[PDB]
């Protein structure tokens, strides 16, 4: 309950970033049509 | 000047992430000749569903003219309300502006009183006839003048935020 | 009949000379124009030195601008170009490409950026972003035989066309709803004698303007175009963009959002915030996973660092603009230093990926030290300059009430420390059997040395000598 | 007097170490002497400033001075020594000189290394001598890079993970500190605000006292290990070179206590007086939790790290339980631990690097080849056992006396907490002697070949003796560290308002 | 949309002097005239009887306009730059106006799905230059 709990937490706070970065880094990825699509979605939703 | 019914106390805080206390204002309310408006003020200054002055500001400080406040909603003047709906008509014009320190419900056209009140740091004889009178400061004139002498930007707001930390009723 | 363009008329003169010399001279140009252009730049800087402490006097028929605050940025862009040209001389020299029109493009883009800093005309402030963007798809693709330099022309031209389109459509909506008006100051009048201000409409011409603004300086939700182009174009133009584009965009944004948008504060103060809170997050997480140097710099030094600049535009009662000026002055230097170091090492070796910077401390320690200094400064550590930059940016911005933007800023700065210290760790090493045969053959050893060494000490001294800079930056009313 | 001492005492090390750079002379030799001479000069100047330019009889600040530095957010060169600071300043000079000496046979770089040592020296003294809050923060974070470099260049097998966890964790912890800085800096900045002396009269409103208190307490619990915030220590201690770790677990930890004493108990009383009992409870449970997890470890470096963790509960319980001696016994404790933990890590790092075995199970009988290490190790183990005579006893005794005679307690927890605290004396030898028995006693193989096995030479032995003698000198007659009359004014504010 | 809230005083004036086209009234002339150039004034506009529908103080910097070229209500450009039979307002001056409905928007409102000005109105002003 020291290595398995609080060490687990103090690593998962620095480990979840290592996963989230590469996870959100592998959406889109080129294909300029996708760039423009994701650029239009935000413009459209921001109109609210 | 007339009889006094209730006595309301206001805190005064300046500093602009947060307000340090500087003093304390104590005002009287003539519940004997303008009962509905005085009751509105006294109820706002205490509680009764949160529509109060706790955490308000003084969003207009015209040096040598007046200080206005009571917009607990937008801090810009276009907000604030009252217990009897959102507005109500004028009550009466018995008490008249006399000298340094009076209270007047800052209207937006006759018959449209609201939350915005204002204190007159100077004499205003011209103003009467179309503004209500429901209070004069009994303690804290110097703090009122200190606020009146605060630094102001182009919008006549104070450059250092002047909030009211706590407000309540203090009986005789 | 006016000297308020003479700071740019000098630049036009130098442009015409640079175009002429190739038409007339034969081959004596290569090291000649290399300093002849610097003459024009320093002469324009001297010309701008005159108009210090001047009046808010209006322009030709009231067209672009002339006040103190705008003059600051007008000089700052010149500073960026003066520091950048010596970098983008030798680099393109060692590619056997024509050099004349490259310097011509850089000069014309700097001219467009200089004119943009004013432009209270609603039309000049439209042509000038094009004078700065039309001269950008060329540089950002001016290595034709390469392949990546074409991808970072397609997915830059398409994007910069769409965005300028959205922006000019917002401009047209404004011109319509405003009863017909262009002059930037004279909109809140004209939007009143025509009583259609508080109505829908304006709410659309605000978003269709803010989006086109964002794209030009790339916060998070529209950052998509930046990471690619910064990797596909040559490193010197990457630096030139990543300094002067941001400076010009942030100079135009504050004026286009503060002068004609008195009323809509509570509806764009929030809006920009939504960008900033994202810009300093999505521009950092990805920055961790990077392995290329240029792309990691795109993420960190731009994707994020365009956060705390904005971090006061929302919280501004004219008591903060000084802090924006100071942070821009710090950022220009703390960014050009590391770009100069990167250009130098890349040319000397021939690689970009991070895994080749190992052992560089032992082969040549001066370059490793002058790169570590700038990187740590970007990290924002106390004795350096970036620390005081971020500090005075927060201390005025916490002093303005908003809390859920300073905390995120400090947290993402702590997060950003990671990759800086990662590359720093990769510098200091001595495991001979680990260093690739790239730093192993490095004949260690003018222009680039001078730029790198005079740009790196300005990343350590001003952070401690910010007193006169602060006293100077407080006189901005625009 | 107006001839500035503290300014010299802060700008001497880093300046006179900046000359190591731009000095092509040798590989390793001359730099060692050029650094030890500067260290000795600095220590001598420190003791000269303390002896004939200090009073011990007035609770004000001494040798103060200030200037104008940035002037926008009022932040000066304000600097001054006081009662609480003096002990830690002297201890820092002493133990860092001796650490720089213990770092003698380093030839890997030997030029960046000694310069970074001097930089950490100057930073520690700058913090311990600060008088302006922002300057206190600057000195706090100035050392963060040198320690990272010392970790990532020399020390341990898995140096990288330890170093990066340490730097990220400390930098993150300092965020709440900077939050508190921004909080109480803007609170009426016309009234000086950023002059740590003129803040004694600040009367903050409610619900803001608590936020600033917590913004400082989180950063302190980060620096000074408190139970839920201690996970970083075993990695950044079990992987550091003993030269680094001496000053690291002997000074850098105690900054988290000195700051908590100086800016919390002196500035935010009604934010600290309504939060003392939970501090006491946390320290009481820490004293036993750290030992109960120390006994479980298997490489003696981490065991020593946890033993250092445990003694940091006495400091906590002395900061709470608001008395003169409870606060005063804490200072004696930080001194008597900056001695013992530093020496124990030096001994651990010196026994190792001779055996190249880290797991406590294969350590044979090392008493046969090297006697003197065994002697000087058992002695300091006894010291860490809170054994009387040595200075590890009187500190804990005064801590007990401070808790017992505390006014903010009525006999219900004043006894149960004392009980749970005294369990530490039953628990600590169980894990110290369990190491002393596996690693030293017993007869291993016939380790006759006098190769890779040599008793401590003159330098290490003199270091051990010169750190040991103060322990005895203090534990016999402790009042050589009770030259503190600020507590008679430090605990003057708190002592009557409500509750 | 339609009227919203505000609060202020008026510094009660003397009797207005119509001068055959509008309603003119002076409060305080201070420093100096202004040519056909950009000016910067502070207004607080009323309805005929009591209501207030906008005030420059309800925003930040008081708005800036052009006094001399037709870009504003003809009433104002007659009562600020100085009309036929009326002296212009000084740099720090202060005047009060009642605008007849011919020198104003006229007999048709400005709609936005709800006319922001009563159809065929005639409003009041308290104009203070700056």
UniProtKB/TrEMBL annotation, chain A:
The chain crosses the membrane at residues 32-48. It comes from the Eukaryota. Signal peptide: none annotated. NDH shuttles electrons from NAD(P)H:plastoquinone, via FMN and iron-sulfur (Fe-S) centers, to quinones in the photosynthetic chain and possibly in a chloroplast respiratory chain. The immediate electron acceptor for the enzyme in this species is believed to be plastoquinone. Couples the redox reaction to proton translocation, and thus conserves the redox energy in a proton gradient. Belongs to the complex I subunit 5 family. NDH is composed of at least 16 different subunits, 5 of which are encoded in the nucleus. This is NAD(P)H-quinone oxidoreductase subunit 5, chloroplastic. It comes from Hordeum vulgare. The chain holds residues 730 to 777 of 781 of the full protein.
TrEMBL record, chain B:
Keywords: Isomerase, Rotamase. It comes from the Eukaryota. Transmembrane segments: none annotated. GO terms for biological process: protein folding. It catalyses: [protein]-peptidylproline (omega=180) = [protein]-peptidylproline (omega=0). One of its GO terms (molecular function) is cyclosporin A binding. GO terms for cellular component: cytoplasm. Its EC number is 5.2.1.8. Residues 19-169 form the PPIase cyclophilin-type domain. Belongs to the cyclophilin-type PPIase family. PPIases accelerate the folding of proteins. It catalyzes the cis-trans isomerization of proline imidic peptide bonds in oligopeptides. This is Peptidyl-prolyl cis-trans isomerase. It comes from Hordeum vulgare subsp. vulgare. The chain holds residues 71 to 242 of 243 of the full protein.
From TrEMBL, chain C:
It comes from Hordeum vulgare subsp. spontaneum (Wild barley). NDH shuttles electrons from NAD(P)H:plastoquinone, via FMN and iron-sulfur (Fe-S) centers, to quinones in the photosynthetic chain and possibly in a chloroplast respiratory chain. The immediate electron acceptor for the enzyme in this species is believed to be plastoquinone. Couples the redox reaction to proton translocation, and thus conserves the redox energy in a proton gradient. GO terms for cellular component: chloroplast thylakoid membrane. Residues 119-416 form the NADH:quinone oxidoreductase/Mrp antiporter transmembrane domain. The chain crosses the membrane at residues 1-20, 32-52, 72-92, 99-116, 154-176, 196-215, 268-289, 296-315, 321-345, 366-388, 400-421. This is NAD(P)H-quinone oxidoreductase subunit 2, chloroplastic. It is found in: Membrane; Plastid, Chloroplast thylakoid membrane. It catalyses: a plastoquinone + NADH + (n+1) H(+)(in) = a plastoquinol + NAD(+) + n H(+)(out); a plastoquinone + NADPH + (n+1) H(+)(in) = a plastoquinol + NADP(+) + n H(+)(out). The keyword Nucleus does not apply. Residues 1-90 form the NAD(P)H-quinone oxidoreductase subunit 2 N-terminal domain. InterPro entries: NADH-Q_OxRdtase_suN/2, ND/Mrp_TM, Ndh2_N. Its main location: membrane. It is an enzyme of class 7 (translocase). GO terms for biological process: ATP synthesis coupled electron transport; photosynthesis, light reaction. Belongs to the complex I subunit 2 family. It comes from the Eukaryota.
UniProtKB/TrEMBL annotation, chain D:
It catalyses: a plastoquinone + NADPH + (n+1) H(+)(in) = a plastoquinol + NADP(+) + n H(+)(out); a plastoquinone + NADH + (n+1) H(+)(in) = a plastoquinol + NAD(+) + n H(+)(out). The keyword Plastid applies. Residues 130-412 form the NADH:quinone oxidoreductase/Mrp antiporter transmembrane domain. It is a multi-pass membrane protein. The keyword Methyltransferase does not apply. Pfam families: Proton_antipo_M. It is an enzyme of class 7 (translocase). Keywords: Chloroplast, Membrane, NAD, NADP, Plastid, Plastoquinone, Quinone, Thylakoid, Translocase, Transmembrane, Transmembrane helix. It is found in: Plastid, Chloroplast thylakoid membrane. Its EC number is 7.1.1.-. Belongs to the complex I subunit 4 family. NCBIfam families: NDH_I_M (TIGR01972). This is NAD(P)H-quinone oxidoreductase chain 4, chloroplastic. It comes from Hordeum vulgare subsp. spontaneum (Wild barley).
